[PDB]
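User: Let's play a game. I give you a shape written as tokens, and you guess the letters that built it. Ready? Here's round one.
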């Protein structure tokens, strides 16, 4: 099977937000609205905002999953490459095979789907801190797009789903990801290509 990537705000007006980090050579994570694409360095913090129009119920959760963007690869599970799955860079919670981790959340849960074998990471959806209008999840991507025997230069999408306590769909959004050494340069390059 293949998970849906259809944008769905749902009853709560769910959608993502991204910071404006620019494209300096030193940047470690940067988002392109024109491309709907996040560019980031390996294992570096990727802040993703969650926005809602109204408060979802207690027990609501937020799941992240990667899929290949190209249809001919969509049924293949996105996982870490044969090198990175063995580099013992565990945080104590994420299985070493999982591409996407959540940083600094002890209530993160990692799922190996018993039927599809796909990986995902899920956290509780809770209200913003006083003074804030949204919540932010910090994700890490644990292989380069180029990793041989893993993503192997194939683009991926991250799908973020807002779910009820049973795992039923409440909302969905998504963005492409490139994990690379120089996110700023690559964003500038791909934006120029799009323009041309
Ligand atoms: C992102 C996020 C987000 C998540 C939740 C949640 C949850 C589930 O857990 C619960 C735990 C205890 C109690 C209840 C739920 C709640 C709010 C509140 N927000 C205030 C601002 C409001 N309008 C501004 C005035 C939007 C215009 C939208 C909702 C979030 O913004
Ligand atoms: Zn790798």
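Assistant: Ready! My guess for every position:
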């Amino acid at each position: 099977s293949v998970p849906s990537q259809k944008t769905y705000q749902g009853s709560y007006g769910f959608r993502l937000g991204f910071l404006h980090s620019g494209t300096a050579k030193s940047v470690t994570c940067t988002y392109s609205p024109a491309l709907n694409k996040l560019f980031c360095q390996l294992a570096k913090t990727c802040p993703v905002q969650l926005w809602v129009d109204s408060t979802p119920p207690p027990g609501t959760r937020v799941r992240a999953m990667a899929i290949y963007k190209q249809s001919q690869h969509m049924t293949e599970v996105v996982r870490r490459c044969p090198h990175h799955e063995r580099c013992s860079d565990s945080d104590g919670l994420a299985p070493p095979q999982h591409l996407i981790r959540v940083e600094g959340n002890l209530r993160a849960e990692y799922l190996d789907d018993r039927n599809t074998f796909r990986h995902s990471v899920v956290v509780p959806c809770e209200p913003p801190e006083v003074g804030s209008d949204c919540t932010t999840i910090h994700y890490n991507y644990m292989c380069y797009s180029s990793c041989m025997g893993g993503m192997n230069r194939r683009p991926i999408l991250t799908i973020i789903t807002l779910e009820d306590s049973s795992g039923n769909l409440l909302g969905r959004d998504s963005f492409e990801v490139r994990v690379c050494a120089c996110p700023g340069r690559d964003r500038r390059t791909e934006e120029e290509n799009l323009r041309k």
